[PDB]
Design a protein around this ligand. Structure first.
Ligand SMILES: Nc1ncnc2c1ncn2[C@@H]1O[C@H](COP(=O)(O)OP(=O)(O)OP(O)(O)=S)[C@@H](O)[C@H]1O
Ligand SMILES: Nc1ncnc2c1ncn2[C@@H]1O[C@H](COP(=O)(O)OP(=O)(O)OP(O)(O)=S)[C@@H](O)[C@H]1O
Ligand SMILES: Nc1ncnc2c1ncn2[C@@H]1O[C@H](COP(=O)(O)OP(=O)(O)OP(O)(O)=S)[C@@H](O)[C@H]1O
Lengths: 436, 105, 187, 117, 424, 422
């Protein structure tokens, strides 16, 4: 029936929160935090307040979800009353963000009813004179990752907007969102004195019962769409009320390691779309065996399934590669030291008994995949630079490790020898070589 | 360290309770007030001190005391003299000294 | 050879000793503890009768079914007195709760018991230095003084000459190093 | 690097392309649109002058970039490896996954001023 | 200028002017000064002489931010319009590149847009040729000093010309600035006026508050009981307890002596009573009132108190499992910086050193999410996740290496409070 | 609701990609991770979905044929207006310059310019962008991958056309840097020995029965009318044996099997008979010689002259001979495995004058063959390759392994193994 599929239409967009803004559902463990945000934001526009704030909390904590929820909550009734300018610290550098502001300004003017033209500092004094200066348009600033603007060197752009609090007749409000906790020490003196010092910490799921209360409000549909709905609602809580039920059991695991709702929210999306009839879906949340397969696939090739998916030789090279690595003090080992001890390992197997010992010219083809399976690392290799110009400074630098040949790049170890004994089963013949 | 001796035991807490009971017995009262424990702790601390040889109102009182000489003294004999006639014990003001030191006054 | 040791250390902190002082003054709240009966607590006369009946009426056997969990409980302390103590511990677990046959879950807690009942820089540097001044002494003795001297000689980790005296005492008494004379120090 | 080895080389053919033709970006964008940018098709050749001085992982990462151009069918690629000597040294330095890419139609022509006098 | 005509809109639907709304209007940081009263003259009498005599001087003031040096010199020039000059606010931090201030000066003499190269040629051509008047504020001088001092030499070499119609006013962060960044050749040109600005004192911090509270302290509002709207049905009054204003002063003068910090802590404490008043009656947004001492007690503490302690006890289990392992290595080795593989080595070991107890229901879950099918994980579940979560939180810090074993980890908060918050 | 395809070994993974992708934008999650190593057919199984779904619209980008992010933005903006021309040709357009963009602001500046003229559409249509190979971009860093995550939210959310992403990358150490963003991931496992052979047989039957190298060998031998099934069997007998005699050498690859087949196939074809078409086991016994050798290597006696040969044989001596021992043991009166030490100049001629057969004094040609050996990259500089001539601080070192030294010792009749003594 399409009515079961219509219930899939409702349940999915409930799991993404893409409902119309009247029915977007905020969990109970943060309802206080949005209201004090609301008391900040709605008196900034209506009562023309000119005060700033910094949102602070970890990643995936509904922070950008909270703010545009207020805007949509105010877009229904205060349409022309305000404009929003949203800046990411990621997408904007220090200097193009000036062009980021001015270009996003002028497109609001056609929506509310010569600015970007000029040099970068020409348009900069323009928006200075247009901001510092029936009712006045108020402007809401949305800043994502404001900590990256808070670098050591210049900090110009923070200094201008915070002085716009002090002098401008245009009512503004600033919204810093970040995750660096002690944001206030990152600022210097002259900017912090411009700052109105009010930060608000974002809550976490402090009790096991909280997210249990959240997922109940998450999955339950309240509006009547499908005939299945009344049947579907009582199946949900019956799994949730029982502490010995598997869905209630597996939510406890998510409380333990992650303690973060959108991780668990991610898991349910395939679980409710993989069903094809109504009764299969109810058994799925009754069994929750799909969550096992899901946590299998999320785990299947980080490190262990990397190891399980290799042939007999690739194990035997790496097993020898750690027995060399245990000997030296730093643990580094060359390719010649690997193949030498690999030779006597195979010779020990025949003398205690028929195994094809390979050559030199072929192990390189196996050695190529092992370094790009990250079971080894180069000895002094900074992997990923943080930003662009630090990576560009590493590209021009001609290297010395390529100038020594392939068989002498001093490769070090990612997975230590003692941990191999716990994963390699005793049925394999090389199990005597895991231990020394 | 160098001038230290022993540690806090539950028998000393029981002895403090017994000394407070003895102080209440000497006042012939059926109950133990706040005045006995602050005397017993002062007794057990001054027993070892010879080797070296409810707050806002108190803060207001301190300000009143200041409105004369403007002195930030560390230990008191004539600040506490205007407190006992009011109704608060010696222990409440003792916390008011330490707390407030966070006001840097 | 001791069957059971007990670390009964306090390690004083908050939200623990406060309940300790509250429970010690809760019977000082009333002059007589007549209100001790409304809690989950067996009386002494019922307890000794149950204990005397269980000690003379139950002869539990330790079956082979609890073999597998015992081997692995032994190797964790090995990675025979402990095995002889834990089999008497497991049969006492079987002695309680009116059981004639021992069960697999009963040794789990027993081991948790002996794992919860028991739950270097200093001397290392010490010996290190001792070795040093030995070497630099042409192996002659390190002095109390020079010892203390080089050992406070580093600001980092503050080796107090008393602490020094103590650990020194330890190693010597541990027989690792020999020190003689009240007024002198020997490496 | 990988980067300027691409960027100068695309520049060097592009001026050679306009001079026979009678604004654009200097990367592989021109390679597919060369049928439309210049009409006739393309057969480029790569005179790698001194091949053993180059860091071979740059060369190995270079040839994988050329491997992506094999799906347009109006372009033909040809590589000339002017080694100084020591062919056995060269099969040691590269990645073995790319030697199997190299070994389709190889030709070991000798060019020496002193060849049997 | 232009677009302020377009920044106006029409429909303003009767915003509720409550009791504490009219406070924050004057508690805005905009609108003679009590604290720097005589030093205003010391600037002005230094400035009045050169202005009415057509000379070229230099005036150097310093001090911590929040002392009025942004404010006072604006009050100098403001009265001077009543009695020949071109006022420019050459801010240091409002220049994108340091050379961009050169463009402004040549713009602010005739109206031309020329090179920072081509500006300073004609600027130099101005400053030694014109027969005979320019006031310039060189604000926040930490910005324009950084590269090679070639800019800063220009701004005082123009002062040396006797035919230069210019009056410069430098305002810095520190008095030390021409002694620890500039050369002595600039330090000869800076002069030795050096007007020092101290902090504010707590008596004057009372005397700065009531200047904003001039016509509104203990005054009366006209209020309808239905909407909470106040007008300068009851006729209510609102009083400000001056002792709480005093304890605001005795802290801010103690730590910083900052005039923004004094106003804003009063501004933060004002809105605490705003929401509690709205909590008890609910007038929304469409007998005698006061502000207690208990408001400024919280809001001043609200500048101080943290949450990383409360953040840590509200984290995940494996987060608190991680830090407890990390302090165990720091008291094992005493090296405060442990290798990442040794931590993974420890959290394995910290399972089985505890007994066969809850720990097993942990140890089941700690290596597989149930699901006895898929098991035998080496490192723990979500070990990349919590280590990423501890990284972007700022609690931890991990140096960059492609090896995921010998990359070092360093703590970033005090390890004792990490030890202390672990106890809960 | 969607029309899923069906493939060989992605029965779980086809479901999730049918789950995490719908034509409706609201059900569609924003960002997505398809992760797995090379050798899983992710570019196969993604396009194989898309051919079965003509209802959606896919724009295919290829980062590996680009080199940097600055063209990668130019790669995106050129293609969406290229695609939306071919989806809604009635809509008029102020076509913008995709060459103009070079900075991450300029994309969302231009996508603000692109999508606004397309506002008059009838329903919220999604538009899937596909990036293939995000880890092997050759200028990547930490702060590029997050830079492309938040691009959706800088767009106006209420536009009729919504751009969403799918990221293809590898090297799962890289994904562990960004698990805290918790974007939905679908990992792709590696393969097992049977399903390698099972994939390989249903993908290589279409060429190896239709190659002319078979078709020549059909008419060259006395052709019995063997069936295509008889051609299918010998093809299947080939594949089921070639993965059996080589799996330990190659791992669980597919690309490294796809070419080793195409090297050993015509050499297998020549060793068949008319009769061994019915006789597969003895056919392997006759074609045995290729199944135990790799044949991927397409040992030189080196070209260099005699005085240059002794110039090499003295340079290998300071891989173990320290200055504390050498002047005693080489009077005119083991690190064979280890990495070589560092030379200086004239220590060569110190050893070179000793070990040469007073018989030589002129050193002009000896100085000739040094920078001859420098161009051969057999002895290279420690520092940059510029100032090494004038004797500043410059250290030298060999780059030749022991065996090529050992042959070149006997090639000039010189004995070297005596002077290497552990
Ligand atoms: N357009 C959207 N509508 C509704 N919810 C959204 C939308 N985009 C993201 N979310 C939700 O946002 C949550 C993630 O938290 P965010 O605040 O977006 O990220 P954050 O880490 O908390 O802050 P950011 O985004 O990293 S700066 C998830 O629950 C998403 O479902
Ligand atoms: N004496 C005063 N009388 C009245 N208002 C004052 C007084 N001092 C400061 N203010 C106000 O407090 C604000 C503080 O700004 P200032 O102290 O002028 O700037 P500042 O001291 O230069 O700090 P900066 O600009 O970051 S170096 C002023 O803008 C006024 O609004
Ligand atoms: N289920 C399958 N059925 C048929 N062929 C398959 C299947 N899975 C993989 N393949 C084949 O495997 C080949 C590998 O293609 P790729 O997608 O390039 O591999 P890869 O793992 O994606 O490496 P890349 O290209 O670097 S991402 C495809 O060309 C298919 O022919």
């Amino acid at each position: 029936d399409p009515g079961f599929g219509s219930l899939q239409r409702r349940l999915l967009q409930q799991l993404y929160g893409t409902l119309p803004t009247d029915e977007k559902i905020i969990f109970t463990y943060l309802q206080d935090c949005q209201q004090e945000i609301d008391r900040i934001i709605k008196q900034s526009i209506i009562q023309k307040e000119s005060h700033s704030v910094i949102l602070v909390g970890p990643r995936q904590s509904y922070k950008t979800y909270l703010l545009d929820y207020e805007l949509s909550l105010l877009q229904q009734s205060y349409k022309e009353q305000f404009i929003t300018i949203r800046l990411n610290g990621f997408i904007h550098s220090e200097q193009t963000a000036i062009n980021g502001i001015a270009t996003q300004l002028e497109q609001q003017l056609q929506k509310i009813h010569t600015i970007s033209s000029g040099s970068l500092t020409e348009v900069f004094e323009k928006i200075l004179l247009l901001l510092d200066s029936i009712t006045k348009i108020t402007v809401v600033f949305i800043f994502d990752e404001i900590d990256t603007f808070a670098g050591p060197v210049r900090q110009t752009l923070l200094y201008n907007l915070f002085d716009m609090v002090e002098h401008s007749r245009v009512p503004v409000c600033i919204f810093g969102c970040t995750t660096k906790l002690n944001i206030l020490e990152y600022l210097e003196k002259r900017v912090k004195s411009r700052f109105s010092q009010r930060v608000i910490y974002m809550p976490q799921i402090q009790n096991l019962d909280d997210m249990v209360d959240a997922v109940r409000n998450l999955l339950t549909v309240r509006s009547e769409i499908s005939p299945w709905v009344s049947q579907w609602n009582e199946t949900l809580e019956k799994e949730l009320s029982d502490p010995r039920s598997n869905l209630n059991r597996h939510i406890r695991m998510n409380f333990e390691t992650f303690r973060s709702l959108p991780t668990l929210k991610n898991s349910i999306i395939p679980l409710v779309a993989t069903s094809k009839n109504f009764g299969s879906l109810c058994t799925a949340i009754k069994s929750c065996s799909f969550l096992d397969i899901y946590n299998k696939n999320q785990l299947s090739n980080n490190l262990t399934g990397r190891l399980q998916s290799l042939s007999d030789l690739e194990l035997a090279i790496l097993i020898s590669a750690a027995r060399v690595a245990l000997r030296a003090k730093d643990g580094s080992f060359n390719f010649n030291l690997a193949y030498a001890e690999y030779e006597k390992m195979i010779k020990a197997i025949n003398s205690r008994i028929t195994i094809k010992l390979w050559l030199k010219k072929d192990v390189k083809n196996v050695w190529e995949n092992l370094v790009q399976l990250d079971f080894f690392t180069e000895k002094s290799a900074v992997g990923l630079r943080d930003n662009a110009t630090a990576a560009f400074y590493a590209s021009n630098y001609q290297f010395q490790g390529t100038m020594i040949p392939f068989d002498l790049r001093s490769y070090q170890m990612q997975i230590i020898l003692q941990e191999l004994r716990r994963i390699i089963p005793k049925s394999n013949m090389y199990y005597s070589w895991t231990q020394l | 360290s160098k001038f230290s001796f022993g540690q806090a035991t539950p028998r000393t807490l029981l002895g403090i309770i017994r000394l407070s009971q003895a102080l209440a017995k000497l006042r012939l009262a059926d109950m133990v007030d706040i005045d006995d424990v602050e005397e017993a702790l002062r007794l057990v601390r001054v027993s070892k001190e010879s080797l070296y040889q409810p707050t806002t109102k108190i803060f207001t009182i301190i300000k009143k005391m200041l409105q004369e000489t403007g002195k930030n003294t560390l230990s008191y004999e004539n600040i506490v003299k205007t407190v006992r006639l009011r109704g608060f014990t010696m222990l409440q003001l003792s916390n008011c000294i330490q707390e407030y030191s966070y006001l840097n006054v | 050879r001791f069957d059971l040791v007990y670390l009964v250390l306090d390690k004083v902190d908050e939200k623990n000793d406060r309940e300790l002082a509250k429970h010690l003054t809760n019977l000082y709240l009333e002059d007589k503890p007549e209100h001790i009966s409304q809690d989950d607590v067996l009386p002494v006369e019922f307890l000794t009768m149950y204990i005397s009946y269980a000690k003379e009426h139950i002869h539990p056997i330790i079956t082979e079914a609890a073999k597998t969990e015992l081997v692995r409980a032994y190797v964790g302390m090995r990675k025979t007195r402990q095995l002889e103590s834990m089999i008497r511990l497991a049969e006492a677990h079987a002695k309680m709760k009116l059981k004639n046959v021992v069960e697999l879950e009963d040794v789990q807690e027993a081991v948790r018991l002996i794992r919860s009942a028991i739950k270097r820089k200093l001397q290392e540097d010490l010996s290190r230095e001792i070795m040093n001044v030995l070497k630099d002494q042409a192996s002659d003795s390190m002095s109390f003084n020079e010892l203390i001297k080089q050992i406070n000689e580093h600001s980092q980790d503050r080796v107090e000459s008393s602490d020094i005296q103590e650990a020194l005492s330890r190693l010597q008494q541990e027989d690792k190093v020999i020190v003689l004379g009240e007024g002198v120090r020997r490496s | 690097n990988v980067r300027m080895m691409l960027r100068r080389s695309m520049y060097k053919l592009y001026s050679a392309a306009d001079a026979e033709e009678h604004d654009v970006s200097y990367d592989l964008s021109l390679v597919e649109n060369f049928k439309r940018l210049f009409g006739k098709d393309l057969a480029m050749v790569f005179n790698f002058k001194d091949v053993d001085s180059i860091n071979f992982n740059t060369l190995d990462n270079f040839i994988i970039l050329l491997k992506s151009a094999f799906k347009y069918d109006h372009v033909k690629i040809s590589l000339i490896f002017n080694i100084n000597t020591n062919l056995s040294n060269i099969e040691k330095n590269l990645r073995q996954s790319t030697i199997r890419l190299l070994k389709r139609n190889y030709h070991k022509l000798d060019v020496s001023s002193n060849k049997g006098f | 200028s232009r677009f302020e005509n377009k920044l106006k809109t029409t429909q303003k639907h009767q915003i509720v002017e409550t009791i504490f709304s009219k406070v924050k209007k004057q508690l805005n940081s905009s609108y003679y000064l009590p604290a720097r009263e005589n030093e205003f003259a010391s600037i002005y009498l230094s400035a009045y002489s050169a202005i009415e005599s057509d000379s070229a001087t230099t005036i150097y003031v310093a001090g911590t931010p929040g002392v009025g040096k942004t404010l006072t010199v604006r009050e100098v020039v403001k009265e001077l319009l009543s009695s020949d000059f071109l006022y420019v606010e050459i801010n240091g931090l409002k220049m994108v590149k340091p050379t961009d201030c050169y463009e402004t000066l040549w713009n602010k003499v005739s109206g031309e847009r020329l090179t920072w190269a081509a500006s300073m040629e004609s600027l130099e051509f101005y400053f030694k040729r014109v027969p005979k008047t320019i006031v310039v504020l060189l604000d926040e001088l930490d910005a324009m000093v950084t590269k090679s001092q070639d800019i800063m030499y220009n701004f005082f070499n123009w002062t040396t010309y006797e035919n230069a119609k210019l009056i410069v006013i430098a305002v810095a962060n520190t008095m030390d600035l021409p002694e620890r960044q500039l050369g002595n050749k600039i330090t000869s040109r800076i002069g030795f006026t050096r007007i020092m600005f101290t902090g504010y004192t707590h008596e004057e911090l009372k005397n700065i508050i009531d200047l904003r509270l001039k016509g509104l302290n203990d005054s009366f509002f006209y209020v309808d009981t239905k909407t909470g709207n106040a007008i300068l049905v009851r006729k209510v009054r609102l009083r400000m307890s001056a002792d709480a204003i005093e304890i605001a002063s005795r802290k801010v003068a103690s730590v910083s002596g900052d005039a923004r910090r004094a106003l804003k802590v009063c501004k933060r404490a004002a809105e605490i009573a705003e929401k509690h008043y709205m909590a008890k009656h609910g007038y929304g947004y469409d007998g005698v009132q006061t502000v207690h001492i208990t408001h400024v007690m919280k809001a001043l503490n609200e500048t101080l108190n943290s949450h990383v302690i409360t953040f840590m006890t509200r984290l995940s289990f494996t987060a608190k499992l991680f830090i407890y392992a990390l302090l165990n290595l720091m008291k094992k080795n005493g090296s405060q910086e442990q290798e990442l593989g040794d931590i993974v080595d420890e959290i394995k070991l910290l399972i089985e050193v505890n007994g066969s107890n809850f720990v097993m229901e942990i140890a089941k879950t700690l290596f597989q999410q149930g699901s006895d099918n898929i098991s035998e994980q080496l490192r723990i579940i979500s070990w990349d996740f919590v280590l990423n979560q501890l990284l972007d939180a700022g609690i931890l810090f991990k140096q960059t290496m492609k090896n995921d074993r010998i990359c070092c980890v360093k703590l970033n908060i005090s390890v004792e409070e990490a030890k202390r918050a672990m106890n809960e | 609701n969607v029309t899923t395809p069906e493939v060989a070994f992605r029965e779980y993974q086809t479901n999730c990609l049918a789950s995490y992708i719908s034509a409706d934008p609201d059900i569609t999650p924003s960002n997505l991770i398809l992760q797995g190593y090379s050798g899983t057919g992710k570019t196969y199984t993604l396009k194989k979905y898309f051919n079965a779904n003509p209802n959606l619209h896919a724009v295919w980008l290829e980062p590996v044929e680009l080199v940097s992010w600055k063209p990668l933005l130019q790669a995106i903006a050129r293609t969406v207006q290229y695609k939306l021309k071919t989806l809604y040709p009635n809509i008029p357009t102020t076509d913008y310059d995709p060459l103009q963009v070079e900075e991450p602001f300029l994309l969302v500046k231009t996508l603000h310019n692109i999508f606004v003229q397309y506002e008059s559409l009838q329903e919220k249509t999604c538009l899937f962008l596909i990036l293939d190979g995000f880890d092997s971009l050759q200028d990547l860093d930490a702060a590029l991958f997050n830079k492309y995550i938040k691009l959706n939210e800088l767009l106006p959310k209420d536009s009729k056309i919504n751009i969403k992403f799918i990221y293809t990358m590898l090297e799962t150490s890289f994904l562990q840097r960004y698990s805290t963003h918790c974007i939905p991931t679908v990992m792709f496992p590696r393969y097992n020995v049977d399903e390698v052979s099972t994939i390989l047989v249903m993908s290589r039957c279409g060429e190896l029965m239709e190659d002319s190298c078979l078709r020549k060998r059909i008419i060259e031998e006395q052709i019995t009318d063997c069936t295509d099934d008889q051609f299918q069997n010998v093809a299947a007998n080939f594949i089921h044996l070639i993965v059996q005699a080589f799996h330990s050498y190659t791992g669980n690859d597919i690309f490294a099997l796809n070419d080793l087949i195409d090297f050993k196939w015509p050499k297998y074809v020549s060793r068949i008979t008319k009769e061994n078409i019915f006789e597969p086991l003895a056919l392997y016994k006759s074609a045995i010689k290729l199944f135990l050798s790799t044949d991927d290597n397409l040992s030189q006696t080196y070209d260099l002259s005699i005085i240059s040969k002794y110039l090499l044989i003295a340079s290998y001596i300071c891989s173990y001979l320290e200055p504390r021992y050498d002047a005693s043991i080489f009077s005119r009166k083991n690190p064979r495995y280890l990495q070589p030490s560092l030379f200086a100049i004239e220590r060569l001629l110190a050893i070179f004058q000793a070990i040469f057969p007073s018989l030589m004094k002129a050193n002009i040609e000896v100085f000739q063959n040094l920078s001859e050996l420098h161009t051969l990259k057999l002895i290279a500089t420690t520092m940059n390759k510029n100032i090494d001539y004038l004797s500043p601080k410059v250290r030298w070192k060999v780059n030749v392994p022991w065996e090529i030294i050992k042959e070149i010792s006997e090639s000039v009749h010189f004995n070297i193994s005596d002077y290497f003594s552990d």
